[PDB]
Amino acid sequence: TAIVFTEVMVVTKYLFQFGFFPWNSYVVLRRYENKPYFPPRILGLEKT
Amino acid sequence: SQQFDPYPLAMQFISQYSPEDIVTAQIEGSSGALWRISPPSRAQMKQELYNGTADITLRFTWNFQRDLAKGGTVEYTNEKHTLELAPNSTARRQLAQLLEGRPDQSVVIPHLFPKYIRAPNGPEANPVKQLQPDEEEDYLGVRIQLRREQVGGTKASDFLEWWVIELQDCKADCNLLPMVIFSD
Amino acid sequence: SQQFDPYPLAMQFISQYSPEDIVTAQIEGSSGALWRISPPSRAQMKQE
Amino acid sequence: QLRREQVGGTKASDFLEWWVIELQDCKADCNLLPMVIFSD
Ligand SMILES: CCCCCCCCCCCCCCCCC[C@@H](O)O[C@H](CO[C@H](O)CCCCCCCCCCCCCCC)COP(=O)(O)OCC[N+](C)(C)C
Incomplete structure (x- = not known):
């Protein structure tokens, strides 16, 4: 379960990373720069 | 923020301040009062502005008064920007021309x-x-x-x-000068 | 005090202060200075 | 005025x-406005 979970996590982060998703617009990201409760940041799917 | 988004230092500075903490001062340009100067002092102004040898200073001073009931000790915050005018430079000669009484002359500093x-x-x-x-x-x-x-x-x-x-480059609010100030 | 004697709140307030602690400011009405306003700004005043 | x-x-x-x-209702000190102020 550890190996499967880490594999799934890396792939999911990679998929979300793409900029086409609305969360990532360079405006939403900039204003939500250090707010800890941005939904992607809490779920770990935020792109950096 | 969008206007100053590419720049990193500017972006961090603006991010530091809350939106309800920055104010724009719409200081009027043309809505002034009569220029009161004694005729001898105005004549001396024009003569020194024409045939002057020492550079003449020209200062632009701002001064903000903030409410003292909200705490804080200092109640006035002021500062000046000083610009020099070397003798016979284009600006000084232009001002000496300006005082001559031309109908539509103008100067640009x-x-x-x-x-x-x-x-x-x-x-x-x-x-x-x-x-x-x-x-x-x-x-x-x-x-x-x-x-x-x-x-x-x-x-x-x-x-x-x-x-x-x-303002030097004005399109429609020519009778108004904005001034954005960030108050801690 | 005699002028504001019937009123209770006013009477207590005035009683609170010493006689040498209240001052009357005889601000002059007519003894002002010339009104200085640029003719364009006065015309705009009247029109507005 | x-x-x-x-x-x-x-x-x-x-x-x-x-x-x-x-002042609106002035009789003889019309050229003067009093203003009483209490200073703590
Ligand atoms: C962001 C949120 C993500 C949520 C994801 C939830 C996933 C939680 C659980 C993680 C996966 C479950 C793993 C449980 C495994 C238990 C059974 C396991 O022991 O069987 C293994 C077998 O496991 C299989 O091999 C692989 C299983 C792969 C399961 C993939 C699950 C994918 C789930 C994707 C969920 C995505 C959710 C996305 C939400 C947005 C035994 O391996 P073994 O026999 O010794 O291997 C021998 C290798 N040989 C043959 C080469 C010698």
């Missing part, structure tokens, strides 16, 4: 109006160093002009004078 | 203006 100012809890309202990195080329230019109004006889003292300044 | 004083031509700018205010 480059880099005199710092648009972004900071008002700390101390008596130093320094222009933001960051939003204007050049610190001398990022200052806006100002177009100065003198308006006459006949009354009525001595020639130069015969009629009312006042001064109208406007 | 507004007071004028001719000097001397443009019409409205032709002469001096100043403003005189007085």
Whole structure:
């Protein structure tokens, strides 16, 4: 379960990373720069 | 923020301040009062502005008064921007021409109006160093002009004078100068 | 005090202060200075 | 109230203006406005 979970996590982060998703617009990201409760940041799917 | 988004230092500075903590001062340009100067002192102004040898200074001073009931000790925050005028330079000669009574002459002083100012809890309202990195080329230019109004006889003292300044590059709010200030 | 004697709140307030602690400011009405306004701004005043 | 004083031509700018205010119900000190202030 550890190996499967880490594999799934890396792939999911990679998929979300793409900029086409609305969360990532360079405006939403900039204003939500250090707010800890941005939904992607809490779920770990935020792109950096 | 969108306007200053590419720049990193500017972006961090603006991010530091809350939106309800920055104010725009819509200082009027043309809505001034009569210029009151004794005729001897005005004549001396014009003569020294023409045939002067020492450089003449020209200062633009801002002064913010903040409410003292909200705590804080210092109640006025002021600072000046000083611009020199070397003898026989184009600007000084232009002003000496301006006082002559021309109907539609105008002068342009480059880099005199710092648009972004900071008002700390101390008596130093320094222009933001960051939003204007050049610190001398990022200052806006100002177009100065003198308006006459006949009354009525001595020639130069015969009629009312006042001064109208406007921003160098103005399209529709030419009668208004904005001034954005960040207060800690 | 005699003028504001019937009123209770006013009477207590005035009683609170010493006689040498209240001052009357005889601000002059007519002794002003010339009204200085640029003719364009006065015309705009009247029109607005 | 507004007071004028001719000097001397443009019409409205032709002469001096100043403003005189007085209390609404004034009998003999019409040229004076009292203002009582209590200082702690
Ligand atoms: C962001 C949120 C993500 C949520 C994801 C939830 C996933 C939680 C559980 C993680 C996966 C479950 C793993 C449980 C495994 C238990 C059984 C396991 O022991 O069987 C293994 C067998 O496991 C299989 O081999 C692989 C299983 C792969 C399961 C993939 C699950 C994918 C789930 C994707 C969920 C995505 C959710 C996305 C939400 C947005 C035995 O391996 P073994 O026999 O010794 O291997 C020999 C190798 N040989 C043959 C080469 C010698």
